[PDB]
Every structure is written in structure tokens, then in C-alpha cells.
Assembly symmetry: D2
Homo-oligomer: 289 residues x 4
Amino acid sequence: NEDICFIAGIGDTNGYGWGIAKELSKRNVKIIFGIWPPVYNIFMKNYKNGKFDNDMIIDKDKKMNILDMLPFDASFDTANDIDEETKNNKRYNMLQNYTIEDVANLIHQKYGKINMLVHSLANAKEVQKDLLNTSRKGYLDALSKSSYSLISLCKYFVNIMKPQSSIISLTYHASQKVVPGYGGGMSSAKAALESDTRVLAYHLGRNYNIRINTISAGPLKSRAATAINKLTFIDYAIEYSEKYAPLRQKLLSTDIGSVASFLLSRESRAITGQTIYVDNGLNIMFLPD
Amino acid sequence: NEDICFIAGIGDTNGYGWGIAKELSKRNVKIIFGIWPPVYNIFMKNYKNGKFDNDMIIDKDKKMNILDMLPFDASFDTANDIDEETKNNKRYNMLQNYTIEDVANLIHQKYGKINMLVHSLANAKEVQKDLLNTSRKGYLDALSKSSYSLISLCKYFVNIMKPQSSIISLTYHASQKVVPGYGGGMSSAKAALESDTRVLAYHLGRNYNIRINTISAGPLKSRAATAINKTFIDYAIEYSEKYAPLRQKLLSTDIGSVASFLLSRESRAITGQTIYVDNGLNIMFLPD
Amino acid sequence: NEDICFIAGIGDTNGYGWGIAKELSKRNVKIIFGIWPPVYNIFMKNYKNGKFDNDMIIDKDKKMNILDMLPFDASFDTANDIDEETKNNKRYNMLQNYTIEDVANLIHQKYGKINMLVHSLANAKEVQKDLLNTSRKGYLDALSKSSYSLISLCKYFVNIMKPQSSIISLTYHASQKVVPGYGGGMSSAKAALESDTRVLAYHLGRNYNIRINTISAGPLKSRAATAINKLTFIDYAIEYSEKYAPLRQKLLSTDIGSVASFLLSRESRAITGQTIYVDNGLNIMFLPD
Amino acid sequence: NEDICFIAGIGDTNGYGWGIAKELSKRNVKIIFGIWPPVYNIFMKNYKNGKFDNDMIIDKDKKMNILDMLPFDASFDTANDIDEETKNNKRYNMLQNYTIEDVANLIHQKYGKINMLVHSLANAKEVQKDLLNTSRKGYLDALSKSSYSLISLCKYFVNIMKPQSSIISLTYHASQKVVPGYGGGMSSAKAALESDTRVLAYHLGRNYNIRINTISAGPLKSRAATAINKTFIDYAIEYSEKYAPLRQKLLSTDIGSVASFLLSRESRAITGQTIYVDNGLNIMFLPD
Ligand SMILES: NC(=O)c1ccc[n+]([C@@H]2O[C@H](COP(=O)([O-])OP(=O)(O)OC[C@H]3O[C@@H](n4cnc5c(N)ncnc54)[C@H](O)[C@@H]3O)[C@@H](O)[C@H]2O)c1
Ligand SMILES: NC(=O)c1ccc[n+]([C@@H]2O[C@H](COP(=O)([O-])OP(=O)(O)OC[C@H]3O[C@@H](n4cnc5c(N)ncnc54)[C@H](O)[C@@H]3O)[C@@H](O)[C@H]2O)c1
Ligand SMILES: NC(=O)c1ccc[n+]([C@@H]2O[C@H](COP(=O)([O-])OP(=O)(O)OC[C@H]3O[C@@H](n4cnc5c(N)ncnc54)[C@H](O)[C@@H]3O)[C@@H](O)[C@H]2O)c1
Ligand SMILES: NC(=O)c1ccc[n+]([C@@H]2O[C@H](COP(=O)([O-])OP(=O)(O)OC[C@H]3O[C@@H](n4cnc5c(N)ncnc54)[C@H](O)[C@@H]3O)[C@@H](O)[C@H]2O)c1
Ligand SMILES: Oc1cc(CCl)ccc1Oc1ccc(Cl)cc1Cl
Ligand SMILES: Oc1cc(CCl)ccc1Oc1ccc(Cl)cc1Cl
Ligand SMILES: Oc1cc(CCl)ccc1Oc1ccc(Cl)cc1Cl
Ligand SMILES: Oc1cc(CCl)ccc1Oc1ccc(Cl)cc1Cl
């Protein structure tokens, strides 16, 4: 009764955020979507015109229930951080309460305390460039949006969460092993996110009795994954994974969703600070056959 | 759905095996216990006498359903492998079909194909000596009983398992970081088990679509734990409860619920992994 | 003959930069110091007034030879990055050619190509705050100065280095395991630096035949280490290390120096992308005695 | 300074043992070879006949100085441990004092205390089977000969070593990541060796101030390498030279110079570590 989850980073039904929502919905968790303002209106219109109705089907006797859909920009910690230009930008100007602190405030006012938090977002202006050719601005952009955003979400949401709550994010193995193509400091940001997950596990665990983990997911053809193409990257990764992983089956977003759902529930009470691989075991291989 | 799990390594209700059994029971999984022969009759006697009745309560509605309880010795792959001294032992002489292969055949003959396998056992005759003073015989005993036994279990059990079945074992972080009193080559055996888990994941995944993972548990005051010296387990528990990120008592069923998840279809995309279930203790460097 | 090493991050004789210089000097490597402008003048005056003469003694029949001492600020990639305020700041206004590109240009013009590069610097405005209380600005500051600086040094110095050159930086185990007190996103920056070391190893190795590694050093009572005190941290770490490390001896900066010197020489030709622990084995322990 | 190193595991000049010997020789370290008895006489014969003369050249001025060459079997801890079948073997019958303890005593009696120890040997009778089809006897053989042998070497050699001495062994990344043809429990043995290296580092560091590390080498076309199947070693080398960050031929002396550094006082603050000497291949995820 009243498991409520905020999922930060959903833009359509093709990413891991949607897979996580669907699996949580199956367990009767109420879902709140945090949607980045550049794609918020297109998301809502698609939703309203029933474009997602097929994608919301679960048991065939069961359909996803979404409690709310909120504009959310993980770039901004508080209203005071929003630069005048963004505030007046065409896509932002008609939206309110979209900073990290404001969304936490909003959620709490509307629904009270929550017990489940999902960071399912990343961004990097220079993802198309190799690390060596990444500018300082681009690298800091990657760390700001992909890594720091997790820390800030935690700082503001822990006030609206019950003890024994659970927090997950999503990472990629390029943090630990070299993946050519994963540029722009994205590798660096995932390494930071994985290390920050431990440090946060310590603070949140001791001061709040809240857990935090990260899922290192295998390749999924999401909207963001396609934007790694330069001049494709995700097709190569998928093909390589389906060919060489211990488990040669197609990796689904709901495969990640059911792990997320376990880590968010009380069943994972003794697990915290961990990077959990959900990648058909690809990470354990050294040399291909 | 008619799931069956063989749990190898139950001697009483104070260890991880029991906790795993309880949590699986919540999911209506049928449970079969593999019990080490030296403690088989005492176990059956305590069970008959009702000593375990309270430990078997799953909640208001439910009692643990235990399908069967069989003698099982991981020292022996097949009937041919038992020596005369064991053949002649008081405790073994009155039992049979307790080698790894015999138990696979016996389960398959009685109940058919299973789909869940749990390795929750270890042994090391020189556990109380430090690695440097461990003999070759002692070291190889630790590896034989604590590591090779997992390979052999897999080798014989795959024949009686369904596709998409799942397997787990238990390990300890002494494989990766030094724990002074974890002697007798137990640290070595755990290191080998964690690596074996990967290699097996490759073979079982490609050839049978079967998953295997290992749970690295924090300290639990079980029978075997009380055998280690610095008492060791009392120190480990106090340290964990003082310094772990989550300052709560680690329960066998905390491991049980993770095991149950790893053994279900929910974790279909996870294989070859060491999953830490230790209140986050493994992430700490410097005690604060 | 003409092994030349640029050591970026030396402010006095109490840190690892000095230890590395001393060990390299023992192998007749010519040393160039890159000195942060806020402490450059005080460094030079101390040096001139012979305050370091004791510290430069090697064999007792041998004294360190320093080829040059250059103002260096790893915050700035090129002259064009320097903000008007810094340029006119009291401590910067009389200094020139101190950006990463300008120092590379300068070194090359003056001495030709070099074959050894040391990143021995870190910085974080909010090191005194726990990760959870670190602001976005502070976290980005830590990543900018401690992590990105390595990438930029590489990008500009690879043009002035010979094939088969070697590059090292210094890291700390807080990247992998939680160390309370190592705040301000310093942990996050070290995690990034260690992951960037791999990615760079790949690019530099393939395109230039240049190696790069990082040394994860144990605790040393350097000037920066003392600035971690809040309201001390380094005294605790030293005491803990001397008590519980497999090797219970005092960790010296020249202990790190002799490893650095090995990794910079041709003897380590087949080692790249690695994090090498020089910490009396402390990292291998789980529970104290 | 009068340094002496025992190198256990030299059979010819094509392996890592020889490379380590050569590089140490550059530093004027006196070298003692431990040679597996089945290949001892053939080795001595090739040496006498000058087959190794060119491989022994250190440069313009220097030839490798080899202090002694002794039969050494890591299967056996003491004289008591040899079975009748080995006692009776053609190759062994004409040799003696080749158990681990006997060799420590023999070296100490002839040359005094040493300060450097190299473990450069492995064996696994079922290397050509995959882990899942490896027998208990085969698995334990791999662990006995490839892992326990390091512990035993340390146990017997510490008595004859100086304080601040240093010890190294060789491992392979198959302990950490799956390499399909690395069978017979060799992956398990390497996992145990890397963990054992840590535990030993604790014991030897606190008790004797002695260091121990392990070098994880990339592929070298040695005698033993040619025993593995997918040829395996030909594939590994081609893959490494194509995908490693450094695209250069890995030489035994590339491992040698790192070994020499780890065995010197230069690395006094390094212990219990796995050091990768593989042209950076281990850092790659996806072949590009
Ligand atoms: N797709 C893969 O193959 C893959 C593999 C490993 C990890 N991941 C991780 O999973 C997570 C989700 O990625 P995805 O693959 O589902 O792609 P996706 O496009 O479905 O998810 C990215 C979402 O984040 C949102 N977003 C971007 N910047 C934001 C900001 N500042 N504030 C709020 N929202 C913002 C975007 O609108 C987008 O909807 C990412 O962290 C990614 O690194 C993905
Ligand atoms: N207890 C802890 O603190 C702890 C921490 C980490 C990991 N573990 C692991 O969890 C597993 C379960 O142990 P536990 O802690 O529940 O103690 P336990 O005594 O409850 O379980 C060990 C069981 O293994 C059985 N066994 C021993 N030798 C056997 C053989 N040759 N064949 C068959 N069975 C044999 C014993 O009868 C015993 O019941 C072990 O593998 C242990 O390494 C335990
Ligand atoms: N001291 C330790 O215990 C310890 C342990 C592990 C790692 N390290 C690492 O070793 C490295 C050196 O630290 P240290 O301990 O020798 O302290 P230190 O003060 O001797 O070294 C830091 C130096 O970097 C310089 N610096 C700071 N910002 C700079 C910039 N933007 N451009 C150029 N130079 C700048 C400072 O002037 C200072 O001299 C750091 O990377 C640190 O993280 C230190
Ligand atoms: N060759 C490679 O590609 C490679 C890669 C990584 C690690 N390694 C490791 O390097 C080490 C050296 O092997 P190598 O590659 O030089 O091959 P090698 O054949 O040159 O060395 C192995 C030696 O071990 C000896 N040996 C075998 N059983 C023995 C016993 N019971 N007692 C004493 N000696 C015994 C053999 O006589 C042989 O000379 C091995 O431990 C191996 O695991 C090799
Ligand atoms: O992390 C990712 C890892 C993979 C490996 Cl298959 C594919 C997509 C990913 O997600 C992103 C990658 C880059 C950027 Cl800029 C944003 C995002 Cl959400
Ligand atoms: O693996 C273990 C780790 C700990 C750390 Cl708390 C405690 C108990 C353990 O289990 C055993 C330990 C030694 C032996 Cl001989 C058998 C077993 Cl079942
Ligand atoms: O990295 C470090 C690790 C330790 C652990 Cl003993 C001590 C000092 C360190 O160096 C710094 C720490 C913080 C900041 Cl702001 C700058 C620097 Cl140079
Ligand atoms: O460890 C090894 C790893 C590789 C990967 Cl290139 C090649 C050779 C190796 O050495 C052995 C391998 C198997 C056996 Cl039975 C003995 C030895 Cl000495």
C-alpha cells in the first residue's frame, strides 16, 4: 500500500526508464515520471493521443498505472540555479517546479513521502568525441548531468523518503573497461557514478537507513543510444552481446526492470553500495570465441 | 508453477541453507535438503521431535513445505569414490546413495526434473591454521569440499534440470581481501569458487541456458562459523553491526530473499556474478 | 641521455612530487617543475635563499639537478581560457605562458621533445564537506582540476613527446572503497582519473605508442593532506596505515618516487592503463586485527 | 651487493623463467634454477652442448651467470611425500633432494641465505578439458601443482631468506575473466594463487617483513602454452597483438624487467598485488 516511485529520465517507451516503470507497475507500485522539458510536451501529446497504449499493456489482463507526469530537469538543483535564458526558453517558459528541489517539494505536497527513487538519465554534449578530444566544458557537462545529478537527487529526495527506502541508478561497463565510442567523458561520468554510489551508500545508510545501488545494464536500442552514432555504435554492441554473452538471448528493458524492482523492494534489504550487472553475463568474458 | 529446489548443506536451522529454504518456501518452491551424513540422523531426530517447528513458520497462513531430506556428501562424486573407512563409519554404514551422482539420480527418480540448485556448504580440515602453516592435504581438502563440490554438483545435476534453471552458491569476501582468521585455504577455496562461477556461467549459459551466480554473505552465527578462530564470528558480527553502512542485524533470510530472487526468472539477465549481501560492509576502506 | 621529465604539481618538498623528482634525479633524468602560480613566488624565494638545499641531497655524494621551474596552472588549457580576473590577479599578473598549451609550447621551444610526464596535483574547493553536501560547483571544481587536467595535459604534451614515452598520475583508494573525510567530490575525481587512465591508455597506446598509468599512493603528510582537516584526517590515516598494513614501516615520498621512476622508464614497456598500489599493501586488508 | 634468486620452473629458454633470469642477470643477481625432474637431464644436456649460449647473452659485455641448476618437483613438500611410482621412475631414480624442503636445505647449505624467490611454474593434467568436464583428481592436481606449490615454497624458503626479501609468481587473467580454452581448473588455480598472494603478503609482511606479488602476464609461446587447446596460444598472441593498447610483441624479458623491479628494494612499498604485464590487453572490453 502506497509504494510510490519517482522515475527521473523517461522520454518515450524505448528506454530503460519505461522497462523499470512497467515492472514496478506489475508489483502495484505507483509511478511518477520526471520528464526533461525539451521532450515533455511531445511526451504528453503522444500519451494523450493514446500512442503509448500498446506499450502500457502488462498481463494482457493488466495495464500500467501512472500516478503523475512532471517536468524535470536534473541540471538545476533549485529555482535559484536556473539561468534567465533557460527560464525564458520556448520549451521551458510555460513549465514550473522542474528543478530537483522543486519537484521533491511538489511530490511531497501532492502525495506525501515516497519510498522508491530511480535515476535513469545521462547526458553529454561531446559524446561523439573520444575522451582525448573532449573539451573541459564538454567533460564537465557530462559529469554535471550524468553523475552530480544523482548526488543532488539524493540530497533533496531523502527529505521526502521514508526510512528503509531504496534508490537505484543505471551505469555502463565502459567505466571499468575501455569501450571505444563511449566518448565525451561518459566513461568518466559512469566511473564517478559507481564510486559515488558507494560513498552515498555510506552516508544514506548511516544517517537515514536508506539504500542505494546501481545497475550496470547491457546494450538497449533506446533514443539516447542512437545518438552515440557519429558521422552504428549501439548496433555493434547489441550484435556483439547477442553473439558472445554467456546468455545468447535478446536483452529487454524489462529484464532490467525486474532487477530494479527487486533492488527497490524490501527483498534486497541487505544490499547497498553495489554495482549489479544485468547484461546476460557479457562482463565476465575476456576473449571472444 | 511446480518449482523444485535442491539445497545441499543443511545441518540445522541456524545457517544460510535454512534461511534460503524459508524464503523459497514463501514462493511455494518445493524444497529438498541434502544433509551431510555425519549429522543426518541427529537432524532427522530433531525434526521428528518437533525442534524445528517454530523455525518452519513462514507466517500466519504458511508452514515450510519440505519435500524430502536426503543424506548427501560432497566429498564423493560417485559410488566408486567412497573409501573403506567411510564405508565402515558408524554414521555412514546405515545410509546409502549419498554421493553426488547417486543423489541426482535419486531425486530425478522420485520427483523428476528440478529447476533450482543451491550450494550452501564448505569444509576445511585445517581452517584453524593460517594459510602459511596449512598442509597440502589440508589445503586440497578445503578446495575439494568447498570448491570442486560446486563443479561436481553442476556436472551431475544439469542432466536433471530444466532449461532456464538457476544455481547459486555462497562465498565470503576473504577471497578478495585479507581476513586473518579465515585459514586452512578457505580463502583460497572461495577465490576459486568465485572464478569457477564465471567459467561455469559461460559453459552452462551457452550449452544449456542455465544461470549460475554466487552470493557473498556477511557474518552469521551458524554452526560452521563457530569453528573459526581469531571467537572469530563474534568479532565479525560486532564489527559488521558497528561499521557497515546499514547498521542492522544480518539475518539468514536476508540472504534467503536474494537467493530466491537469483533463483527465479526475475533475474534472467544475471549470470556469473558475485552479489554482496552484507549490509554494504564490503564497500568500506577505513573504519570511521 | 636527455631523459627529460615535466612534473606538474610541486609546491614545496613535502609532497609526492618532490619524492618523484628526487628518485628520477638519481637516475640522471632532467627535471622541469610546473608550479601553481599562487605558490610560485614563495617556492622560488625559498629555493633561492637555499631553503631546499638539505632536501636536494641524494647519495650524500649526489644532489638533485633541476633543469627548470615554470609557472603552471592546470585549470587553463590555452591562453584563451584565462578569464580577465585571473589574468590581472596579483599573483598571476607578472607571470606568462602558464596554461597547459603554453607550457608545452615553452618546454618544446626551450628543450625539444620530452619523454616523461608526471601529473601530481589535485584540488577541490569543498573537500571539507561530505559528498552528499557538496554543491554542483564544488563537485565540478574537483573534477575539473583533479581529473580533466590529466586529459588536457595529455592532449597538449603528446605533441612534444617521443614515441615510447610514459605518463603517470597519482590516485587514492577512496575511489574504490569508502573513506569518510575524503569529501568534496575528491573520491569521484579519483574514480574518474583511474577510469580515464584506461581510456587514455587505449588512445595514446594505439596512436602514439605512449603509455599511461596511475599510482594509488598510501598516506603522506603533505601540505594538501593537512588541508583535509575540518573544524586530523591525515594523522588518522597514517596511524591506521602504520598499524594495520602488511608492511608496518613509514611510507616515504621516495617510496612512491622509485615506483614512478620505474613506470616512467623503459623497464615498464609492457605495462599500461594500470592503477598500481604503492601503499605498503594496506589496500588488500578487509578487517583490522 | 651479493643477491641470490631461486627461480623455480625453468625447462628451456622459451618461457618466462628464462626471461626473468636474463633481466635479473643484468642487475648482477646470482641465479639458481629449479628444474622439473622429467626434463632435468635433457636441460643439462642442451646446456652442456651449448644450445643456450646465444640466449645467455645479456649484451656486449655480459653473459648470464648461472650459479646452480637443481632438480625441483613442486608436487612434493618433503622426502616423505614421494610415492613408489615416482621413486621408481626412469627420470627420478637417478636424482635426489628434489622435494621443496630438500631444495631449500640444499641451497642454504651450499650458498647460504637468499633474498629473491620466483615461482614460474604450473601444471594441470586435465588442462585440455573444460572446467565442467574436469574430474576431482584433475582439478585438485591443478591446484596442488599450480597454487599450493607457492604456499609450500614460501613455507620452506622463508627460513633461508633475509629480512626484506621478495617473492613473485606468475598468473593469468583467466582467473578474473572467462577464457574458454583455459581448462582443467587452471583458471581456478590462478584465482586461488592471486588470493593466496594477498593472504601470504599479510603473513610474510607482518611476521618477516618479506614482500610477495604476482605478475599477470600476457601470452608467450612457451612449452606449456603449446599444451592448451582452443592452437590456443597462436590465437591469444594474434588477438593481443591486434587489440592490445600497445601493439608490440610481448617478450619474456618484458615480464623479466618487471619481475626484477618487484624483486628489488625499489618496490619496497608494494606487496600482495597482481601487476598486469600484458601490453594493457586486460583493460579492453569491446574489440574495436
Ligand atoms: N541504452 C543502453 O544501452 C544503456 C546501457 C547501459 C546504461 N544505460 C543507462 O541507462 C540510463 C537511461 O538511458 P536509456 O538507454 O534508457 O536512454 P533514454 O533516452 O531512454 O534515457 C535517457 C533519458 O534521460 C532524459 N534526460 C536527459 N538529460 C536530462 C536532465 N538533465 N534531466 C532530466 N532528464 C534528462 C532524456 O529525456 C531521456 O528520456 C542512462 O543512465 C544510461 O547511461 C543505457
Ligand atoms: N556463516 C557465515 O558467517 C558465512 C559468511 C559468508 C559465507 N558463508 C558461507 O555460507 C555457506 C553455508 O554455511 P553456514 O554459514 O550456513 O554454516 P552451516 O554449518 O549452517 O552450513 C554448512 C553446512 O555444510 C555441510 N557440510 C560440510 N561438509 C560437507 C560435505 N563434505 N558434504 C556435504 N555437506 C557438508 C555441513 O553439514 C553444514 O550443515 C558456506 O559455504 C559458507 O562458506 C557463511
Ligand atoms: N598525500 C597523500 O597522502 C596522498 C595519498 C594518495 C594520493 N595523493 C595524490 O598525490 C598528488 C599530490 O598530492 P600531495 O599529497 O603530494 O600534496 P602536495 O600539496 O605536495 O601536491 C599538490 C600540488 O598540486 C599543486 N596544484 C594544485 N592545483 C593546481 C593547478 N590547478 N595547477 C597546477 N598545480 C596545482 C599545488 O600547488 C600542490 O603543490 C595528488 O594527486 C593527490 O591526490 C596524495
Ligand atoms: N606462457 C604464457 O602465455 C603465460 C601467460 C600467463 C601466465 N603464464 C604463467 O607463467 C608461468 C611460466 O610458464 P611458461 O609460460 O613460461 O611456460 P614454461 O613451460 O616455460 O614454464 C612452466 C614450467 O613449469 C615446470 N613445471 C611443471 N610442473 C612442475 C612441477 N610439478 N614442479 C616443478 N616444475 C614444474 C615445467 O618444467 C616448465 O618448465 C606459468 O605459471 C604460467 O601459468 C604463462
Ligand atoms: O550509458 C549508455 C550506455 C550505452 C551502452 Cl549500450 C548506450 C547508451 C547509454 O546511454 C547514454 C549514452 C550517452 C549519452 Cl550522452 C546519454 C545516455 Cl542516456
Ligand atoms: O565461509 C564462512 C565465512 C564466515 C565469515 Cl563470517 C563464517 C563461516 C563460513 O563458513 C565456513 C567457514 C569455515 C568452514 Cl571450515 C566451513 C564453513 Cl561452512
Ligand atoms: O588525494 C589525496 C589523498 C590523501 C589520502 Cl592520505 C591525502 C591527500 C590527497 O591529496 C589531496 C587531497 C585533497 C585535495 Cl583538495 C588535494 C589533494 Cl592534492
Ligand atoms: O598459465 C598460462 C596461461 C597462458 C595463456 Cl597465454 C599460457 C600458458 C600458461 O601456462 C600454463 C598453462 C597451462 C598449464 Cl597445464 C601449464 C602452464 Cl605453465
